[PDB]
Swiss-Prot record:
Subunit comment: Associates with the 26S proteasome; this association occurs upon exposure to arsenite and is reduced in the presence of ATP. Interacts (via AN1-type 1 and 2 zinc fingers) with PSMD1; this interaction is increased upon arsenite treatment and occurs in an ATP-independent manner. Interacts with PSMC4. Interacts with PSMA1. Interacts (via its ubiquitin-like region) with VCP; this interaction occurs in an arsenite-dependent manner and is necessary for the recruitment of the ubiquitin-selective ATPase VCP to stress granules (SGs).
Job description of the protein: Plays a role in the regulation of cytoplasmic stress granules (SGs) turnover. SGs are dynamic and transient cytoplasmic ribonucleoprotein assemblies important for cellular protein homeostasis when protein production is suspended after acute exogenous stress. Associates with SGs and is involved in the efficient and specific arsenite-induced clearance process of SGs through the recruitment of the ubiquitin-selective ATPase VCP and the 26S proteasome.
Full-protein positions shown: 1 to 62 of 268
Binding site for Zn(2+) 2: C32, C35, H49, C51
Domain comment as written in the entry: The ubiquitin-like region is necessary for its localization to stress granules (SGs) in a VCP-independent manner. The AN1-type 1 and 2 zinc finger domains are necessary for the recruitment of the 26S proteasome to SGs. Both the AN1-type 1 and 2 zinc finger domains and the ubiquitin-like region are necessary for efficient SGs clearance upon specific arsenite-induced responses.
Protein name: AN1-type zinc finger protein 1
Amino acid sequence: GSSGSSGMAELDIGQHCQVQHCRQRDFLPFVCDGCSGIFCLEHRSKDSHGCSEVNVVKERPKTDEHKSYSGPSSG
Ligand SMILES: [Zn+2]
Ligand SMILES: [Zn+2]
């Protein structure tokens, strides 16, 4: 007997500031641009938590890439 069924996915993941000493609550979610850690606004910055900065390998030579940019106007 095959009737079939379905549902929905409604659930808050809820994130917290990886930082310990912090112990904050009711803050805005901000993913650190270093260790990919969601920290509060006060700990959103790297220096704020002395980010290890291990994800982004030190200044290293990359491959030949392309880009695009230009100015709005001149006086
Ligand atoms: Zn925090
Ligand atoms: Zn970090």
